[PDB]
Design an enzyme around this catalytic site. Structure first.
Site, PDB file in Angstrom:
ATOM      1  N   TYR A  30     -30.727 -41.635  31.769  1.00  0.00           N
ATOM      2  CA  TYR A  30     -31.400 -42.401  30.698  1.00  0.00           C
ATOM      3  C   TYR A  30     -30.439 -43.400  30.051  1.00  0.00           C
ATOM      4  CZ  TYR A  30     -29.938 -38.687  27.286  1.00  0.00           C
ATOM      5  OH  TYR A  30     -29.239 -37.779  26.537  1.00  0.00           O
ATOM      6  N   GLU A  93     -31.935 -45.862  36.252  1.00  0.00           N
ATOM      7  CA  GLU A  93     -31.895 -45.707  34.801  1.00  0.00           C
ATOM      8  C   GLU A  93     -33.320 -45.737  34.253  1.00  0.00           C
ATOM      9  OE1 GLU A  93     -29.551 -45.425  32.474  1.00  0.00           O
ATOM     10  OE2 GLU A  93     -27.626 -45.779  33.472  1.00  0.00           O
ATOM     11  N   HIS A 140     -27.462 -37.255  36.184  1.00  0.00           N
ATOM     12  CA  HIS A 140     -26.073 -37.488  35.831  1.00  0.00           C
ATOM     13  C   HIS A 140     -25.459 -36.192  35.294  1.00  0.00           C
ATOM     14  CE1 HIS A 140     -23.084 -40.820  34.320  1.00  0.00           C
ATOM     15  NE2 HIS A 140     -22.579 -40.027  35.244  1.00  0.00           N
ATOM     16  N   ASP A 150     -27.671 -36.588  30.404  1.00  0.00           N
ATOM     17  CA  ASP A 150     -28.923 -37.208  30.857  1.00  0.00           C
ATOM     18  C   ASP A 150     -29.301 -36.748  32.268  1.00  0.00           C
ATOM     19  OD1 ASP A 150     -26.523 -38.909  31.137  1.00  0.00           O
ATOM     20  OD2 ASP A 150     -27.815 -40.500  31.898  1.00  0.00           O
TER      21      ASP A 150
END
Lengths: 246, 246
Positions: A30, A93, A140, A150
């Protein structure tokens, strides 16, 4: 000559049967910020990703770096013994504020249905083209436990599992493994062995220091987000048995 | 043109400035076999590589795997903390018989001027296109010191260094470093520390056992092939300072 021939002259008559993609993993992140600041962070200043999923409806998918190029999103990282994952990964992302600290604990921000609906086909497209198996589509937090949290406890991993994109316990398996454990909590060494088997970088010392606690917590945040303080418990042990690797 | 995308709809209005190549390293190998059999193995066998340099005159350079694909040449491997180098490297094989064990001991096979004359411009071309620095053009022995010896003690590393392709001591620097040492041989721990700095996977125990001896030996085989027995000495210490790591 005129001009005489010179320079390199590759022979391209033969091509090897044994080759595949340089891309081996997909890593989910994120942005910790909104759409315009996400685009700002991901285009200049040293951090980048291949795809950005916006927070509109339907959710726009931006391509920021071509798949055949290395984006800079993973940093210090390891999965299944593979280190420095930038060169061998595709980074996605997602526009999301992350969390806010409050005197009562962190409160995270939810992901929209539209975002999940854009992400699933994108992941299927990438995984099919590069031959990426579900155990190599990770967050991640998986590859940098403790350092990164995240996509966080609100990310709906089971929605991805339902689409065949990540490993997940089969129905009833959690209960079966709990019964197998029979109320006896395994020691820290056992937890460390199990986490490594799943692909995590984790010490094998048998002692519960911060570096091990961070890995337990990353696994918990993904599979048992109700509590991810990194403390060994029976439910976490059952999940370490129940989550497939194959 | 003539086709639409098979994937989801993408917005391409934004492109990140922060990107570079997935290819991080170039790894040099010898084939241990003749030209026609090498082409057979690399085309139809479990091993593959991007380029093959023949032992003919002039030396034919074959391209067997596109640079954007993963070839299978490195196996279990590590350089500068990066593991599993297939996905992140270009592999170059050179036709050469390798070595041969005899009662007078092991003998090694030389590389030809024709081969060097083909290899140098190839390396320059690859390194420029992918932005590969001299410290990341290495041999199989460098990345797998416990297992591999190629390209061996006769490989002309200095010729590559003269062309700016790999690290090598400047004239006068070895003598100067030998002088800084002032007759004092550093301990095994120091040796392990310098080797890790250069890029090798090496223990940090301070004890000189087989794994450390294999790594010192690999460094010696490359930079001091007059003796690669893996034993610390003043000359090897001086080389660990004189060969730059930046």
């Amino acid at each position: 000559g005129a001009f005489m021939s010179s320079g390199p002259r590759l022979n391209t008559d033969y091509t090897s049967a044994n080759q595949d993609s340089r891309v081996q993993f997909i890593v989910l992140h994120y942005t910790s910020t909104d759409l315009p600041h996400s685009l700002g962070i991901l285009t200049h200043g040293g951090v980048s990703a291949h795809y950005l999923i916006g927070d509109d409806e339907p959710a726009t998918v931006y391509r920021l770096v071509d798949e055949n190029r290395r984006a800079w999103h993973a940093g210090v990282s390891e999965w299944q013994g593979r280190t420095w994952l930038n060169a061998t990964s595709i980074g996605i992302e997602i526009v999301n504020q992350g969390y806010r600290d409050t005197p009562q604990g962190r409160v995270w921000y939810p992901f929209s249905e539209a975002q999940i609906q854009a992400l699933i086909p994108l992941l299927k497209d990438i995984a099919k083209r590069h031959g990426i198996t579900p155990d190599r589509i990770i967050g991640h937090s998986d590859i940098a436990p403790g350092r990164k949290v995240d996509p966080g406890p609100l990310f709906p991993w089971k929605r991805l599992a339902d689409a065949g994109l990540v490993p997940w316990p089969k129905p009833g398996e959690l209960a079966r493994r709990l019964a197998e454990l029979n109320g006896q909590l395994p020691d820290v060494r056992w937890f460390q062995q199990q986490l490594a088997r799943h692909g995590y970088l984790v010490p094998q010392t048998g002692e519960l220091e911060k570096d091990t606690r961070d890995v337990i917590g990353a696994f918990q945040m993904k599979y048992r987000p109700a509590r991810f303080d990194g403390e060994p418990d029976l439910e976490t042990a059952a999940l370490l048995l129940a989550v497939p690797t194959s």
